[PDB]
Design a protein around this ligand. Structure first.
Ligand SMILES: Nc1ncnc2c1ncn2[C@@H]1O[C@H](CSCC[C@H](N)C(=O)O)[C@@H](O)[C@H]1O
Ligand SMILES: [Zn+2]
Ligand SMILES: [Zn+2]
Length: 888
């Protein structure tokens, strides 16, 4: 009770609730929050309304010189993001990163479109007390949880000051740090030591309410700490006991405006000029060059107004949910959501993942890739001969529902792909562009880039933004397919031809292939994921892929050359973006590197390059090359590379399983784990691991991740063994619980549930919970109804369950009949003779067996089934529950 603050606190703690809320707002300045709250209600994130009162507080501080935010701003305990968004409106600020705890009983970051929103990056679920410090130019911290006990607040405050000191030690000359309880002795001492070392002073905002004693240690203040605090205490004490409460003085809230901001700094225009010109002309009406466009590594050409496209909804699948009551309690399943594919949705991912420049590899690294890719092209073409693909081939393999991909009104004459390929007028458009290509010109081959609708873990209690996919229109895709599609159609990256690849194989083959690799002598199995593979394909990588041309001649070569040079290298792309005031715009941008996700040969070229990368890593691992060769390759090891490849290559690729950017490799020893110098120089940086930390390997091949699964060997009842795919049961159920959009009627969602159920039966029958849930779903869905919808995006999903045939029959087809690693072709006649994984593995991968929630669920499954049957209604049903032992 010694300090005046302690007297204030004690008097505060003794107030009645009614008086507390009068005193709280007495004589303070308060921003009118009315309009902001209506904005929050009406989902208006483009009107300039700040997410909290925190924007006004920071505004007051900069308008008074107390802090002048600049450069890279770090914001500790950002909450909704109030400070972060205000900083981003400021000219001198170029980057904002917020961190915050989030979760139950804490504020999550809110996603806004305030001016400069593209400079901001908020992160939730972070405990900053144990987050390693990072360099920054401006540092913010608004952490400090109140308490009726000054002693508690004192210790909390100290913990923050102690924490911020680690961050101040790394440069920030600008700062603004909350000091929750400034009047307590140990805090006073800490402030004095900190002020000496880093400067600044303690300030009390007139925007703060009288119910706290918070002060801000800001870099552009100064003064005696003690004096400052006592002056605050006195004001506070003075405002107690009034005869008449006069209330606060009202101010207007800050208006943060809207729209993206330009990034600083940021030219083979010949080969793209026609395309741009044709677009500028077709959309001249509102065409313009936005000075505030957010592109940093893409070159920008212009923008025009368009109607926004995409969705931000996730809806629940009612039938799956009814059959999965125990998972209602699993956060991992219920916080999953469809990704946001609105333009704001994809753009907020675009600025992090796609607008990056992967550096070109250094000269020595190039020379080694050169020899490797020479070797690899030679090896792939040892037996196979390139060829044109035909119109008829295209028409037969085009999905009747492939994207049209119109980029010009002229390309938008058909309502489905099937109609286009059936219309002579389409092929006339193709021919016309074809003849242009033969003359080394390209007029209309242009990508649309948009958000991919995906089922993913949530973010800030809501949906994640979307991954960008891009592809050219049906006509351009035909031309690609004609020139380069032989790679696909004649299976140039099949295992038989590539050694390392796995083209064509369903998931059901993948485990067996991993096992075969395990049988070779060598070290641990590795499986490093490259972060954002397509965005890391360099000019060098493209130049090496371009060596297909040397396998081609005449007309065939010329067509292929146009695809490769005019279409894969000189890419022109159309992407939507949020403009100001709720309107959206189509940007036309370009760049020479990176790989477009929806090129006809993306998988092939990815597989090809990934094999070459692994070959290079193995050479560094086996000693042929090292860091001393990155800047220049000596003639002698340049030759060793050649001979290494020549003598070893064919064996070495058999130690790989390469599916696009997905890789598994069993090197000779474990020097591989530190063979990272070339890997990093080639820009193929590893995902989720410090740049130079060695790679983790596995001893058990059954724990190796490949194409989103790992694989388990299980011995069946009749003594035969199978290798099956296995993965987190939480997400499997999480995804089945999500419907692809709004407005889906009972029958359609029932048919999607039925596809998820049947995919489970065919691939994850060995997971106890799923087999029960699958039979339960199929028992609640009318037998006649036909499975519809996507259950996977993986190229290795072959969809055998998308059928009305009995699932046991198809089980035998893929697991016995067509399974080349199963000698004994003895058919399985009943489900009970189909194995499970060990309960140890089942539980490790999310199973709920042995739990009482599950028990209740299992025992009462029929009630669940009947609930769904009622909703669907009188129809023809069948009970499959009896195919499980416990229901006989
Ligand atoms: N240890 C911790 N690590 C990260 N965040 C924390 C934390 N302790 C508290 N927080 C969070 O930090 C936030 C401070 S309130 C932030 C207000 C913000 N300046 C604005 O204007 O919007 C709270 O939401 C709180 O949940
Ligand atoms: Zn073209
Ligand atoms: Zn598993």
């Amino acid at each position: 009770g010694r300090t005046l603050g302690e007297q204030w606190k004690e008097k505060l703690n003794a107030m009645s609730r009614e008086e507390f809320f009068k005193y709280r707002r007495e004589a303070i300045i308060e921003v009118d929050r009315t309009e902001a709250r209506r904005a929050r209600r009406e989902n208006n994130i483009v009107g300039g309304h700040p997410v909290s009162r925190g924007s006004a507080k920071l505004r007051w501080l900069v308008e008074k010189g107390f802090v002048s935010p600049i450069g890279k701003v770090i914001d500790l305990g950002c909450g909704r993001g109030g400070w972060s968004y205000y900083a981003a409106t400021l000219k001198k600020v170029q980057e904002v990163r917020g961190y915050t705890k989030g979760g139950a009983g804490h504020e999550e970051p809110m996603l806004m479109q305030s001016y400069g929103w593209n400079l901001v990056s908020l992160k939730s679920g972070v405990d900053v007390f144990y987050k390693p410090s990072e360099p920054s130019d401006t540092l913010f911290c608004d952490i400090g949880e109140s308490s009726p006990s000054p002693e508690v607040e004192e210790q909390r405050t100290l913990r923050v000051l102690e924490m911020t000191s680690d961050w101040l030690h790394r440069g920030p000359r600008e700062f603004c740090i909350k000091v929750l309880c400034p009047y307590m002795p140990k805090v006073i001492e800490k402030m004095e030591v900190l002020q000496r070392r880093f400067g600044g002073g303690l300030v009390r905002l007139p925007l703060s309410r009288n119910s706290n004693h918070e002060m801000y240690w800001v870099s552009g203040a100064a003064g005696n700490v003690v004096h400052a605090v006592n002056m605050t205490s006195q004001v506070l004490l003075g405002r107690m006991d009034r005869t008449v409460w006069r209330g606060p003085k009202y101010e207007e809230d800050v208006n943060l405006g809207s729209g993206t901001r330009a990034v600083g700094k940021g030219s083979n225009q010949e080969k793209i000029k026609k395309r741009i010109q044709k677009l500028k002309e077709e959309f001249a009406t509102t065409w313009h060059k936005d000075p505030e466009h957010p592109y940093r590594t893409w070159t920008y050409h212009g923008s025009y107004e368009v109607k926004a496209t995409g969705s931000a909804s996730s809806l629940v699948n009612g039938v799956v949910k009814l059959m999965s009551k125990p998972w209602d309690a699993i956060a991992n399943v219920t916080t999953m959501a469809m990704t946001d594919t609105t333009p704001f949705g994809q753009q907020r991912v675009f600025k992090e993942k796609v607008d990056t420049k992967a550096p070109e590899p250094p000269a020595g690294a190039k020379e080694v890739l050169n020899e490797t890719t020479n070797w690899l092209w030679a090896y792939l073409s040892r037996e196979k001969r390139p060829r044109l693909c035909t119109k008829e081939e295209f028409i037969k393999k085009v999905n009747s529902n492939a994207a049209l991909g119109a980029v010009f009104a002229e390309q938008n004459q058909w309502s489905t792909a099937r109609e286009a390929v059936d219309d002579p007028r389409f092929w006339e458009m193709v021919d016309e562009e074809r003849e242009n290509h033969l003359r080394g010109e390209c007029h209309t081959c242009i990508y649309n880039m948009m958000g991919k609708r995906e089922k993913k873990p949530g973010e800030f209690g809501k949906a994640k933004g979307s991954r960008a996919i891009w592809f050219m229109w049906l006509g351009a895709r035909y031309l690609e397919f004609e020139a380069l599609g032989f790679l696909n159609e004649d299976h140039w990256l099949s295992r038989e031809n590539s050694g390392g690849g796995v083209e064509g194989s369903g998931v059901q083959k993948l485990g067996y292939i991993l096992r075969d690799i395990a049988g070779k002598q060598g070290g641990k199995m590795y499986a490093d994921d490259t972060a954002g593979w397509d965005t890391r394909i360099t000019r060098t990588d493209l130049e090496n892929e371009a060596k297909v041309l040397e396998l081609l001649d005449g007309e065939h070569r010329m067509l292929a050359r146009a695809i490769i040079e005019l279409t894969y290298r000189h890419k022109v792309v159309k992407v939507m973006r949020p403009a100001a005031e709720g309107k959206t715009v189509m940007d036309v941008i370009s760049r020479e590197d990176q790989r477009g996700s929806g090129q006809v040969v993306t998988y092939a070229l990815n597989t090809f390059t990934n094999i070459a990368v692994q070959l290079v890593r193995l050479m560094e691992a086996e000693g042929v090359i090292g860091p001393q060769h990155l800047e220049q390759l000596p003639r002698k090891n340049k030759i060793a590379v050649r001979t290494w490849l020549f003598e070893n290559g064919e064996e070495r690729v058999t130690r790989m399983a390469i599916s696009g950017d997905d890789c598994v490799v069993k090197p000779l020893d474990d020097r591989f784990a530190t063979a990272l110098h070339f890997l990093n120089a080639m820009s193929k940086v590893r995902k989720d691991i410090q740049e130079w930390k060695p790679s983790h390997g596995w001893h058990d091949w059954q724990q190796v991740p490949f194409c989103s699964n790992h694989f388990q060997e299980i011995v069946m009842k009749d003594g035969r063994s199978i290798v099956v795919p296995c993965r987190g049961q939480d997400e499997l159920i999480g995804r089945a619980r999500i419907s692809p959009g709004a407005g889906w009627n009972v029958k359609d969602t029932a048919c999607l549930a039925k596809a998820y159920a049947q995919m489970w039966l065919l691939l994850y029958f060995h997971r106890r919970d799923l087999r029960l849930m699958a039979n339960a779903i199929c028992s609640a869905v009318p037998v006649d109804w036909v499975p519809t919808g996507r259950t996977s995006w993986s190229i290795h999903s072959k969809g055998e369950w998308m059928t009305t045939e009995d699932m046991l029959q198809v089980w035998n087809r893929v697991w016995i009949e067509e399974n080349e690693w199963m000698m004994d072709k003895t058919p399985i006649t009943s489900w009970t003779d189909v194995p499970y994984v060990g309960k140890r593995e089942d539980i490790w991968c999310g199973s709920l067996i042995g739990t009482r929630s599950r028990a209740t669920w299992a025992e009462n499954i029929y009630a669940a089934i009947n609930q769904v049957r009622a909703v669907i209604g009188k129809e023809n049903y069948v009970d499959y529950m009896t195919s499980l032992r416990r229901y006989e």
